[PDB]
Design brief:
With 303 residues, this protein is α+β, with helices and mostly antiparallel strands. It is built from ten helices and ten strands. The protein has two domains: 86 residues, 2-Layer Sandwich (Phosphorylase Kinase, domain 1), CATH 3.30.200.20; 217 residues, Transferase(Phosphotransferase), domain 1 (Orthogonal Bundle), CATH 1.10.510.10. Helices cover 37% and strands 17% of the residues. Strand 4 and strand 5 form a beta hairpin. Helix 6 crosses helix 10. The longest helix has 27 residues. It is globular and about 60 Å long. The chain binds (2E)-2-cyano-3-[3-(1H-pyrazol-4-yl)phenyl]prop-2-enamide (RMM) and sodium ion. The site of sodium ion has 5 residues, from loops. GO terms for molecular function: ATP binding; magnesium ion binding; protein kinase binding; protein serine kinase activity; protein serine/threonine kinase activity.
Length: 303
Amino acid sequence: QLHRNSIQFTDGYEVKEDIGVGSYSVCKRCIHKATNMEFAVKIIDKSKRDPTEEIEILLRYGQHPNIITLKDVYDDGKYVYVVMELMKGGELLDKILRQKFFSEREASAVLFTITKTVEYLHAQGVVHRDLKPSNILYVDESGNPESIRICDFGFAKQLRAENGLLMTPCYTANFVAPEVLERQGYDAACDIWSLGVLLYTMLTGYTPFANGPDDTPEEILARIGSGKFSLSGGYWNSVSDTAKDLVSKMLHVDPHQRLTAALVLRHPWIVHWDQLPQYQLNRQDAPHLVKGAMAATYSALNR
Ligand SMILES: */C(=C(/C#N)C(N)=O)c1cccc(-c2cn[nH]c2)c1
Ligand code: NA
């Protein structure tokens, strides 16, 4: 169902500064010349990536408030211009980490919102397969969890049958190759590991498997081969046992014994947050450092 037409992206929009990334494509700020409104547009090179899987996901699931919403799109025959909502409130992790007053009850509300979003996607047989915090942004500076948006679904995937059919993890019979009943069960928990990395970084101000952008890829991959990230002492003293127990299983090594989004939300730190610290978090603060550390962390994975 795509695509080409008379109208061109140019005709309805003014391009602007490059706002980030990217691997197979470049996102840039733009304006809708009619209303002079601000949007963001990811320009994918068809010769390189195939937008199909991503765009579809966005059409159906964009309705989700906490999911980046798809406001428009074109294909000029060369690239594919996907207009989604521009995010003013900046990066979520980056924002939150500069908050010297932030409480567990408050970090529980953020992660709740994020996992509730991911649980939905999971029952829909869709995996992001890139959850690194740079893809979770704030549509505005309201600082309310309802401004949270998950973004850049370029690397996500639907669960399909061997027949090429939409499917849900509920339905079973209709045939999909066996390895895909595998890679979906991983890619799902793989998202849950990444959320582990967000909650760990959120309660402390450092990422569990890297100190900084300079860490060797081997050492990061090495730290991970183990797990056994430290939940005691330092910035782990004043924190809760509950959340500590939570971060452990979200970050658990076995894709299996590791938590599922659905169970996460059932963990008492998420449900029982009202029993949780309303007071700030002694946290190492190097928002720049942490960012550069995460970057070092994911490159080691994917490269
Ligand atoms: C787009 C790229 C990234 N990352 C990509 N290849 O998807 C991008 C980069 C920064 C910010 C946005 C964005 C989307 N909505 N508002 C801002 C998109
Ligand atoms: Na949305």
